[PDB]
Amino acid sequence: GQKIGILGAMREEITPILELFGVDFEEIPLGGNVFHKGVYHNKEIIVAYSKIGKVHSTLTTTSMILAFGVQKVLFSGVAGSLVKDLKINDLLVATQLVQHDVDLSAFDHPLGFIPESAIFIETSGSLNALAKKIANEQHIALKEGVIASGDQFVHSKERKEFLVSEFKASAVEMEGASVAFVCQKFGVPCCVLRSISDNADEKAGMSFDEFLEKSAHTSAKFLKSMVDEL
Amino acid sequence: GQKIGILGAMREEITPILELFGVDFEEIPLGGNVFHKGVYHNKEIIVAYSKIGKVHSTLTTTSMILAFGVQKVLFSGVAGSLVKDLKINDLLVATQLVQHDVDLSAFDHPLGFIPESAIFIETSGSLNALAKKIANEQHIALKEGVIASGDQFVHSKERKEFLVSEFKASAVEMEGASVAFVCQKFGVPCCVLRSISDNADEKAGMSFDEFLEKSAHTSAKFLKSMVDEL
Numbered sequence: 001g002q003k004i005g006i007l008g009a010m011r012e013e014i015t016p017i018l019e020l021f022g023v024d025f026e027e028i029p030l031g032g033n034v035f036h037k038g039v040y041h042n043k044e045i046i047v048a049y050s051k052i053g054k055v056h057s058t059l060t061t062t063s064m065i066l067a068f069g070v071q072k073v074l075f076s077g078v079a080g081s082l083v084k085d086l087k088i089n090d091l092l093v094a095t096q097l098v099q100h101d102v103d104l105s106a107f108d109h110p111l112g113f114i115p116e117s118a119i120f121i122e123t124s125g126s127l128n129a130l131a132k133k134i135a136n137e138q139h140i141a142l143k144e145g146v147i148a149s150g151d152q153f154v155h156s157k158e159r160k161e162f163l164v165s166e167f168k169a170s171a172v173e174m175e176g177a178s179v180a181f182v183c184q185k186f187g188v189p190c191c192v193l194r195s196i197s198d199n200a201d202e203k204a205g206m207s208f209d210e211f212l213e214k215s216a217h218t219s220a221k222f223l224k225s226m227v228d229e230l
Numbered sequence: 231g232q233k234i235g236i237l238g239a240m241r242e243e244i245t246p247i248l249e250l251f252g253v254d255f256e257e258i259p260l261g262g263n264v265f266h267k268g269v270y271h272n273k274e275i276i277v278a279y280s281k282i283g284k285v286h287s288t289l290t291t292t293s294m295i296l297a298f299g300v301q302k303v304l305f306s307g308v309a310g311s312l313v314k315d316l317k318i319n320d321l322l323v324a325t326q327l328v329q330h331d332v333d334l335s336a337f338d339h340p341l342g343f344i345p346e347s348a349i350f351i352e353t354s355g356s357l358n359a360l361a362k363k364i365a366n367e368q369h370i371a372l373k374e375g376v377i378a379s380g381d382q383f384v385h386s387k388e389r390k391e392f393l394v395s396e397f398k399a400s401a402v403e404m405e406g407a408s409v410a411f412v413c414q415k416f417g418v419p420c421c422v423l424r425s426i427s428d429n430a431d432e433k434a435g436m437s438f439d440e441f442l443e444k445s446a447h448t449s450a451k452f453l454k455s456m457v458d459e460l
C-alpha cells in the first residue's frame with residue numbers, strides 16, 4: 001500500500017497512535033524529531049510528533065516528505081473550539097486552514113495573506129470525504145470546517161471573536177495550517193483531524209489539562225479507522 | 231569546497247546575490263521554491279528566496295539541507311531597526327534569534343519559549359566572527375545582536391518597545407529565527423545577516439519601499455565578501 005505519514009504536535013497526541021496501531025516500530029532520529037517506522041495492513045506508516053507550533057510542524061512535515069517519502073499525511077491531535085456545536089471530545093476535519101497570526105496589513109494585505117501564497121490552504125477532498133463516511137457509519141458527529149493555526153495558545157473571548165469574524169474558523173490550534181501548507185507545496189494529500197480539548201477561552205488551560213489525554217485518544221482512534229480504509 | 235546554501239526571503243533579496251556572484255545558475259524547482267545551483271570559487275552555491283514568513287523560510291531551509299545537502303546556510307536580506315545605532319543601510323549579524331510572536335503564557339511559559347526548545351537560537355560563532363573581521367577590514371560598522379522574528383510586519387512604537395524590553399532585540403524580521411532553528415536541528419552552521427530598511431515604526435512601510443533595493447544589495451554584497459573568505 002501507500003506509505004502514510006501520521007503526525008501529532010505533542011508526544012501525548014502520538015502515544016495513543018503508537019498504542020492503537022500496536023505494531024513494532026523502529027525509531028529513526030532526524031532533525032530533532034523521532035520517526036516511528038512500522039508496517040500496518042501492508043502499508044508503511046511513519047509516526048512522529050513535531051513539537052508545538054508552526055516552525056516545528058513545518059520542519060517535521062518537510063522531513064516526512066523529503067526523507068521518508070510519505071505519499072499522504074494524516075495529522076491527529078487536539079484543538080480549541082470556536083463554535084458552540086463543537087463540544088469537548090467532538091471531532092472535526094479541516095476543509096481549509098489559515099495562519100491566523102500572519103499580519104502584512106502594513107502593506108494593505110488581508111490578514112492571513114502572504115504574497116505568493118493564499119489565506120486558505122486546502123486539504124484532500126478524498127480524505128475528508130472518507131472521514132465523513134466513517135463518522136456517519138459509526139454514528140459520530142464530524143464537523144467539516146476552517147481551522148485557524150497560529151503560534152499562540154488562544155485563551156480569550158477577544159481572540160476567539162477575531163478568529164470567527166475574520167476567518168469563520170471553527171477550531172484553533174498551532175500546527176494544522178503549516179502541515180497542510182507543506183503538503184500542498186509538495187503535492188502530498190493531507191487530512192487534518194482534531195478533537196476538541198477546550199473552548200479557547202479564559203479557562204482553556206484548565207480544560208486542556210483535563211481533556212488532553214481523552215481528546216488525543218479520540219482523534220487517534222478515528223485516524224486509525226481511516227487508515228483501516230486506506 | 232563546502233556546499234553553501236544562500237537564502238533570502240523575497241526575490242528582491244536574492245536578485246543582487248545572483249547578479250553579484252555572476253556565475254551560471256541552473257534553476258531547480260522543489261516544494262514551491264526555485265533553487266539556483268552554481269559553482270563559485272570551487273564551491274557549490276545554492277541560492278533561493280523562501281517567500282515571506284516563518285513557515286515559508288522553515289520549509290525552504292529544510293529543503294536546502296535535506297534535498298541539496300548544503301553544509302552551511304547564509305541568510306541575507308533586510309530588517310527593521312529597533313536600536314538608534316542601527317541606521318538605514320547598516321548591517322548586523324544575529325548572534326541569537328527569537329520567535330517574538332510565540333505565546334504559551336497560558337501555561338506559564340516565558341514569551342518566545344516552546345517546550346522541547348529554547349527562547350534563543352544560536353548561530354555560528356565562526357561565521358559571525360568572520361563577518362566582524364571583514365567589516366573591520368572594510369571599515370564598516372557591523373553590529374552583533376539579537377534578531378526577533380515573527381509573522382507580522384512590525385510598524386508601531388508599542389511593538390518595538392515590547393521587542394526591546396522582552397528580548398533586547400536589535401532588529402526585527404520574519405524569517406531569521408526559523409532559518410537558524412532549522413539549521414540548529416540539523417547541525418548545519420548558519421549566519422543571519424541583515425541590512426536595515428526601516429525603523430519598524432509607523433512609517434516603516436514607506437521606508438521599506440524606498441530602501442529595499444539598496445539595503446538588499448548592501449546585505450548581498452557583504453554576504454559575497456564572506457563567501458570569498460570561505
Ligand SMILES: Nc1ncnc2c(CN3C[C@H](CSc4ccc(Cl)cc4)[C@@H](O)C3)c[nH]c12
Pocket residue numbers: 009010051052053078079080152153154155172173174175197198199200201204208334337345
Ligand atoms: N485554545 C488553543 N489554542 C491553540 N492551540 C490549541 C490546541 C492544540 N494544540 C495543543 C498544544 C497547546 S500549547 C501547550 C504548551 C505547553 C503545555 Cl504544558 C501544553 C500545551 C499545541 O500543540 C496546540 C488545543 N487548544 C488550543
Ligand SMILES: Nc1ncnc2c(CN3C[C@H](CSc4ccc(Cl)cc4)[C@@H](O)C3)c[nH]c12
Pocket residue numbers: 104107115239240281282283308309310382383384385402403404405427428429430431434438
Ligand atoms: N519592520 C519590519 N518588520 C518585520 N520584518 C521586516 C523586514 C524583513 N523582511 C522584509 C519582508 C517584509 S513583509 C512585506 C510584505 C509585502 C510587501 Cl509588498 C513587502 C514586504 C519580510 O520578508 C520581512 C524589514 N522590515 C521589517
Ligand SMILES: [Mg+2]
Pocket residue numbers: 184187188
Ligand atoms: Mg495540491
Ligand SMILES: [Mg+2]
Pocket residue numbers: 414417418
Ligand atoms: Mg548546533
